[PDB]
Amino acid sequence: APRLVEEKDALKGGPHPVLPNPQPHAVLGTLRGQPGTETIYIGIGCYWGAEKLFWETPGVVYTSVGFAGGITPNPTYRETCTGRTNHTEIVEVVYDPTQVTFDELVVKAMEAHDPTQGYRQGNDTGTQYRSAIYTAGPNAEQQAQRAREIVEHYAPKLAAAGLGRITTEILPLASTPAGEYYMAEDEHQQYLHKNPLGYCPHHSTGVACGIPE
Ligand SMILES: C[As](C)(=O)[O-]
């Protein structure tokens, strides 16, 4: 029921980064660009929870959250939430391939969400919550093919669970319409660490003060 907009109808965005000077990762203490690392871009729904999942993974050396897969250049969060940018909520995962592999990170993403729900994840409805893997680096198209093989290996299992087809979008980041990843505002970066009272929406509880543990 959500739908992508025509690119001619998408928000125009802007020419300059929304977060031109990101601060070191609140947990890992790092910035992107360490020699010897690889990058994968993961969309599995609400990026706050997704970012925490990955920065806590052994071998991941930096993460950020932001937007990719759509067309609007340098969107604000508020713009992306309108659905009119076509972007999905993405975690930039920078990792040490001698400690964790591309394959392992794809599997971790697959096992962390329902990759069959289309423009939705759980109670989060919208094209910005769709499942995605965007690849990067000199072997980006080979890595995309590799992700497709892993993802396709789950298809019979998900079919047997009564869930129908996998809807995960898989392609090189450079081959998405905007061709780039855009960081979200500083407040979103490691949001759940900075604000321990915060939590991904639709996860309140019926005990204590309603904040999930
Ligand atoms: C990071 As959200 C509040 O769009 O799920």
Curated annotation (Swiss-Prot):
It comes from the Bacteria. This is Peptide methionine sulfoxide reductase MsrA. The gene is msrA. Keywords: Oxidoreductase. Has an important function as a repair enzyme for proteins that have been inactivated by oxidation. Catalyzes the reversible oxidation-reduction of methionine sulfoxide in proteins to methionine. Disulfide bonds: none annotated. Belongs to the MsrA Met sulfoxide reductase family. SUPFAM superfamilies: Peptide methionine sulfoxide reductase (SSF55068). One of its GO terms (molecular function) is peptide-methionine (S)-S-oxide reductase activity. Pfam families: PMSR. One of its GO terms (cellular component) is cytoplasm. The keyword Hydrolase does not apply. One of its GO terms (biological process) is protein modification process. The active site is at residue 46.
